[PDB]
Amino acid sequence: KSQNVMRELRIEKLVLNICVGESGDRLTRAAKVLEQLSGQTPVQSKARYTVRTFGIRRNEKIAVHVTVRGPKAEEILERGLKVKEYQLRSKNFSATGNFGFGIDEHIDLGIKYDPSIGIYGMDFYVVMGRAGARVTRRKRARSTIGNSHKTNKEDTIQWFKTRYDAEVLDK
């Protein structure tokens, strides 16, 4: 039955990325912003290799990102959709049923502004999934998800439109 309780779409995780191009104080302040928003200590990502054009070097701490799950993820997602005034594009949804958007100022989310911190843009990505994804993530007897149980673009788009009364553009 396609109308089964366990086939319910719901958010798996939300990942918040700030890719400040340099290392030092600015990256630290981006990490402070992320720890403020999520309430969890974020983790800093190192450059995989050196590019002179981008002004980065190998193993230089470039970006910072954090993963949130549960009610806090829902709150942050709707807080970010308010900034987007609940209007994404069809191109924002991947073939695997995940979607993302990017804000440009972190004070638009609804947190206090500090001159020392400044303003950082931010990247939002939501990983969608039904119940039973633990099969692909558990240690013992790991397997794959059946085709009907897979998350795709259309189901995620319809679920987002229904649950948020928003519009998914396609320009």
């Binding site: 990502s45 190192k46 290799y49 590019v51």
Partner: peptide
């Protein structure tokens, strides 16, 4: 605090293939 760990093995990369200009 905490930082991402190197899941990859391209130790002596420092660049990448496919990254060709004019492409």
């Amino acid at each position: 605090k905490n930082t991402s760990s190197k899941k990859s093995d391209a130790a002596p990369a420092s660049a990448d293939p496919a990254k060709a200009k004019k492409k």
